């Protein structure tokens, strides 16, 4: 019954690839709960888009300067 509204009215859904492709912004923010990380989706998207990701974790001054 909860999903009936989505199945009835809205006839389209957007995944991460659709949001990245259909947005004019060059800056994106990703949020998730603890113990769930979605960087593999971004790596797969970069592989599909034939681009290169530079994975820079933050937390230290050396990584901040590198970033």
């Amino acid at each position: 019954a909860l999903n009936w509204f989505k199945n009835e009215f809205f006839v389209d859904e957007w995944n991460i690839a659709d949001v990245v492709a259909n947005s004019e912004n060059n800056y994106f923010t990703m949020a998730s709960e603890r113990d769930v990380d979605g960087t593999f989706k971004l790596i797969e998207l970069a592989k599909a888009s034939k681009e290169s990701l530079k994975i820079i974790p933050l937390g230290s001054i050396e990584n901040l300067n590198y970033a």
Binding site: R34, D35, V36, D37, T39, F40, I55, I56, P57, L58, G59, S60, E62, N63
Partner: protein, 1154 residues
């Protein structure tokens, strides 16, 4: 003469340090050729320093140099980094050790000292006529190299170290090949044990076992091979009793492996079908061998669950082999699963389950020593990355024990580095880029982490880091199998039933005891029980008496009051069932120390001695002032008497010093390591320049609370690793004679990771009686000073029959700053003895009755001001009434005193005060009342008794006033004023004494003056705030000053001595807002005086004296002094009553307003 000797010793130490530094400099640059051209400016600086050192040496033979050398050490950082790059195992050595090993151009004996640091299982190198014959393991095993290494004079350390490293692998492979060929010839392993090293025999036996088991698996027969393995195990068990110690260790480890072989074959025999047998054989680890490889070191590979790993053929020695439990095999399987894709192995679960040991055993089975690191808060991103580039170049298997202890920022930051290492291993990258320098990546490296989640003060790994590790749960180990196999190996005739009884007893003790937080009865206590039962077979035999005695000696001291009865009942239910010299030595040590050997004290001393006999780290827990320090000091004295080994003790307070001062801190400006205090002590013990610590027992006592953040940095020290892993990479071993003591009052905040590692002694009640404590205190006070006649008078007057009822009556009083009456005896005894020794001058001109009455009056006064000195006026009156009734004796009243020997009162002691008009603004003026002179006299009497004084009372009561008024009329004491705040440190106290004291090396913090003592008046002592674990830095610092009489200097880790500095504290009631209760371990050392508000009549009299002094200016209104003062006092009282703290927080009124 003593000062001259101390100066000569300091000059000798400085000269020895300068000579060692110059010898290292001469070795690295001053002697070798073609080494001066790398850095020409540093070459010229080294030439100038060498010329200065030569001139100084010529002047001495006929400071600033050390400063210049230390300045040019920073110029040698790049050179040392390149030297570490040349031989990658130098990352485990310090800079001074690196200087020593490079500078040994022709000595070639300093490298055998650092074998243990660099290699982990080699303690020395066997030399023979300027050549290397072989290496010697830590356990004493001797490995002979295949070919002798020829050494020259121009050769330096790195290339001969590299060829020795390769020769060790070649020798291990050669011994393995010879042993495997001899086993293929058909001989039994009992003759092969006494020929080759343990690792070769282990690998050959494993290869033969897997080949024969696969042969038996080609068919469906296992009984013949199972019986053959059983006879082999019986043969090794028979050979165990008739072999040397080295062969004993070798046979024990082979027995572990053969018991695993027999277990696997027996499990395979009981399989119903072929598929179950095939699955079981695929699950267990198998040691195959390539027959077509032309490379020798890659010819043996290890298979488990399909995946393949390569044996490295690194020297292991004869390690303590672990019992093969099913959890161990599943852990090996998941480690192989993680390492197949070059990931990182990970184990998580509660402490004492076999995680670090499992990783080490996996490394040993894979033929390499696992280098284990103990992570800490100080491990920043740069330090951890330096450790990673140390272990990637070497190729060693790095285990990061306690990975939760890292900061969350560091855990997030090193995720890129760990992913880079994993990707470089997976894709075969030759060079990885870490810390902006391209370093080679050895294909043998791996990373392991063993976190312990679910504890306080531990971070959580981010998921982008946890996705790089394959974690496995290690919640429940199999203690039954471990106990059964260990008991079988040690020679116990009944092993299955005995191990089942041990495990059942431990389970029932865990289930039927009180729910205290320090009761952990897991795998570590079973290992301790077995390790204690191993020596006991000489005097008890391999049976049930041995295990019963071991269970008692391990578990009983850590139990409470009723838990001891539960232990005795359960030990009687499950199990069926001289020490004269040590007891005599203990009694002699107590007699020389002045203690009274009761049943409780002797029982605690026996428990301490028997538990330390096999345990290296101890915790002593009990009430404040229950007898912990006396216990371990008496036992150490008895140890020195009984064994003849001298004892050195280092009492360190853990929470007074910061971690950077305790362990150490890298200086980020120059990347230079600075030794802490415990690290400095350990390094001095390990180096042993003078040979003093060779045959002496070293005790390090941590006399403070068990902060997890402070103690879990020593996790690798406490457990079987016995290695202090520093951030810079140094691996300081713990000698067998180096023991660590933990003295604490509670275990509320400590973790099970610390309690389980250390043997624990619990003090349920005080170890001394009340009268025995009084007698010992009297003896100490007598020794601190006719004398024989006066000693009998005080002791006879201390009648215990009235004293016990006096103490019972005193227990009912209301005491501010609550201290047990067992702890207040020092004030009473020392004050009474000081008063007797003060009035001894006029004790030769009076009769015996007068002497008895004066002594009784002084003892009654001391008992009053000790037992009820921290109570209100009405309570003090009630207590003086009850001490008068509970003692013919001279009566002491509320104002009784002795003047110069006659008894008088305070009403005749009041001096007339006629203040001038202009003297009101002088802050040192005090109007003498009864309470003022009484408090002043008792404060001066307590301060002359060499005791700390804590003055308690409401604000504006007159604590600082009584301080200044008592100390103004004396030329023997100076006063320094320190006002504590919410955020006060030890550095503020030391800064307030920098202009008042002198540092003299006779170190000693003597007062600046020569005739006047110094009094440290600390105000608002409650104000310094607790940390997140509930401890005050300043309060423990002042407790250290009062009790131990000194402190450890943070920068040069040296001990000072406080000689003529007294401490007086001023505090408010703890019920006041913003005030916190201080620890009783500090308040135990200080006499407490309660200074209350003056009475309304007394306030009116004081301020009518003030108003008369004022109205001396206006003579026509001198008749209104009393109404004005009474009006002002009434106004103050009504303002105090009406406007309370409940309306506003700043509505605090005092006589300061008046």
């Amino acid at each position: 003469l003593e000062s001259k000797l101390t100066k000569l010793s300091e000059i000798q130490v400085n000269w020895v340090e300068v000579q060692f530094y110059w010898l290292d400099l001469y070795g690295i640059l001053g002697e070798n050729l073609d080494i001066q051209n790398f850095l020409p400016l540093e070459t010229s600086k080294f030439k100038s320093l060498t010329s200065e050192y030569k001139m100084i040496t010529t002047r001495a033979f006929q400071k600033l140099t050390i400063d210049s050398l230390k300045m040019i050490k920073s110029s040698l950082s790049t050179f040392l980094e390149r030297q570490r790059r040349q031989f990658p195992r130098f990352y485990f050595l310090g800079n001074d050790d690196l200087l020593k090993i490079i500078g040994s151009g022709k000595h070639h004996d300093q490298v055998s000292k650092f074998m243990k640091k660099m290699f982990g299982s080699i303690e020395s190198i066997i030399f023979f006529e300027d050549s290397i014959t072989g290496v010697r393991s830590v356990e004493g095993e001797v490995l002979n190299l295949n070919e002798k290494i020829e050494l020259k004079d121009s050769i330096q350390a790195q290339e001969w170290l590299n060829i020795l490293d390769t020769e060790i692998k070649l020798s291990v492979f050669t011994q393995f090949r010879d042993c495997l060929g001899q086993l293929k010839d058909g001989t039994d392993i009992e003759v092969v044990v006494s020929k080759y090293i343990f690792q070769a025999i282990l690998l050959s036996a494993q290869v033969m076992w897997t080949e024969l088991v696969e042969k038996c698996l080609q068919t469906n027969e296992f009984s013949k091979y199972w019986k053959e393995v059983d006879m082999k195990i019986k043969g090794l068990l028979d050979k165990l009793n008739k072999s040397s110690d080295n062969v004993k260790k070798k046979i024990e480890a082979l027995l572990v492996e053969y018991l695993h072989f027999n277990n696997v074959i027996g499990q395979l025999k009981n399989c119903s079908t072929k598929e179950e047998a095939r699955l079981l054989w695929a699950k267990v680890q198998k040691f195959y061998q390539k027959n077509d490889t032309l490379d020798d070191l890659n010819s043996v590979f290890i298979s488990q669950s399909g995946y393949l790993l390569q044996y490295k053929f690194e020297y292991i020695g004869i390690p303590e082999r672990l019992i093969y439990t099913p959890l161990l095999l599943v852990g090996f399987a998941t480690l192989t699963d993680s390492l197949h894709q070059k990931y990182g192995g990970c184990f998580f679960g509660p402490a004492g389950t076999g995680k670090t040991e499992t990783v080490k055993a996996f490394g040993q089975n894979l033929g390499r020593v696992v280098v284990v690191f103990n992570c800490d808060d100080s491990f920043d991103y740069q330090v951890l990355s330096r450790l990673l580039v140390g272990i990637t170049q070497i190729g060693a298997w790095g285990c990061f024990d306690e990975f939760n202890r890292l900061d969350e920022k560091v855990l997030s930051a090193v995720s890129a580095n760990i992913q880079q290492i994993q990707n470089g291993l997976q894709v075969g990258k030759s060079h990885i880029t870490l810390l902006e320098e391209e370093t080679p990546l050895s294909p043998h490296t791996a990373v392991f982490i063993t976190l312990n989640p679910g504890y306080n003060g531990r971070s959580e790994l981010p998921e982008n880091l946890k996705k790089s590790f394959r974690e496995f749960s290690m919640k429940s180990p199999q203690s039954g199998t471990i106990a059964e196999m260990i008991l079988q190996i040690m020679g116990f005739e009944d092993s299955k039933s005995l191990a089942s009884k041990i495990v059942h007893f431990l389970e029932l003790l865990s289930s039927k005891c009180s729910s205290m937080n320090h009761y952990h009865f897991g795998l570590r206590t079973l290992k301790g029980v077995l390790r204690n039962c191993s020596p006991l077979v000489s005097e008890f035999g391999e049976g049930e008496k041995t295990v019963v005695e071991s269970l008692k000696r391990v578990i009983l001291p850590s139990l409470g009051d009723t838990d001891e009865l539960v232990f005795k009942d359960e030990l009687s239910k499950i199990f069926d069932s001289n020490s004269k010299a040590i007891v005599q030595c203990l009694k002699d040590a107590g007699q020389r120390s002045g203690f009274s050997m009761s049943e409780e004290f002797l029982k605690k001393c026996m428990q301490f001695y028997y538990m330390q006999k096999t345990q290296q780290a101890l915790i002593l827990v009990g009430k404040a002032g229950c007898g912990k320090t006396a216990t371990w000091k008496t036992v150490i004295d008895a140890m020195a008497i009984f064994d003849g080994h001298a004892n050195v003790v280092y009492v360190i307070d853990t929470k007074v010093l910061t971690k950077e001062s305790l362990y150490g801190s890298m200086l980020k400006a120059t990347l230079e390591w600075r030794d802490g205090l415990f690290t400095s002590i350990l390094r001095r013990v390990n180096d042993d320049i003078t040979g003093t610590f060779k045959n002496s027992r070293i005790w390090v006592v941590f006399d403070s609370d068990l902060d997890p953040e402070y103690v879990e940095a020593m996790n690798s020290v406490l457990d079987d690793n016995k290695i202090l892993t520093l951030p810079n990479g140094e691996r300081l071993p713990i000698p067998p004679n180096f023991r660590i003591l933990f003295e604490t009052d509670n275990l509320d905040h400590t973790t099970p990771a610390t309690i389980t590692r250390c043997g624990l002694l619990w003090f349920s009640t005080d170890v001394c009686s009340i009268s025995s404590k009084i007698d010992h205190l009297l003896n100490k006070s007598y020794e601190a000073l006719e004398l024989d006649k006066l000693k009998d008078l005080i002791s006879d007057s201390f009648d215990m029959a009235s004293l016990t009822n006096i103490f019972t009556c005193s227990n009912d009083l209301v005491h501010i700053l609550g201290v047990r009456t067992f702890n207040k005896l020092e004030t009473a005894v020392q004050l009474a003895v000081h008063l007797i020794s003060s009035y001894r001058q006029w004790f030769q001109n009076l009769d015996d009755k007068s002497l008895k009455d004066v002594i009784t009056l002084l003892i009654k006064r001391s008992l009053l001001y000790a037992l009820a000195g921290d109570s209100t006026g009405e309570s003090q009156r009630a207590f003086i009434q009850t001490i008068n009734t509970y003692f013919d004796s001279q009566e002491l009243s509320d104002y009784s005193t002795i003047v110069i020997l006659s008894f008088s009162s305070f009403c005749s002691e009041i001096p007339s005060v006629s203040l001038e008009a202009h003297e009101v603004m002088r802050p040192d003026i005090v109007i003498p009342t009864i309470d003022t002179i009484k408090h002043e006299k008792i404060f001066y009497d307590l301060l002359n008794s060499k005791r700390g004084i804590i003055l308690c009372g409401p604000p504006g009561s007159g604590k600082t006033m009584i301080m200044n008024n008592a100390l103004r009329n004396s030329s023997l004491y100076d006063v320094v004023g320190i006002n504590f705040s919410k955020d006060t440190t030890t550095e503020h106290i030391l800064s307030a004494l920098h202009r008042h004291t002198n540092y003299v090396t006779t170190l000693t913090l003597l007062p600046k003056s020569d005739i006047k003592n110094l009094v440290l008046f600390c105000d608002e002592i409650n104000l310094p705030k607790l940390d997140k674990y509930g401890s005050q830095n300043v309060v423990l610092f002042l407790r250290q000053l009062m009790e131990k009489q000194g402190f450890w200097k943070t920068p040069e880790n040296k001990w000072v001595t406080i000689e003529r500095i007294h401490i007086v504290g001023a505090c408010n009631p703890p019920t006041d807002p913003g005030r916190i209760p201080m620890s009783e371990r500090f308040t135990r050392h200080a006499a407490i005086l309660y200074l209350g508000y003056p009475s309304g009549k007394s306030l009116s009299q004081i301020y009518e004296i003030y108003y008369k002094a004022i109205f001396k200016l206006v003579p026509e209104f001198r008749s209104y002094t009393e109404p004005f003062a009474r009006a002002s006092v009434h106004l103050y009282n009504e303002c105090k009553a009406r406007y309370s703290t409940g309306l506003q927080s700043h509505y605090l009124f005092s006589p300061r307003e008046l």
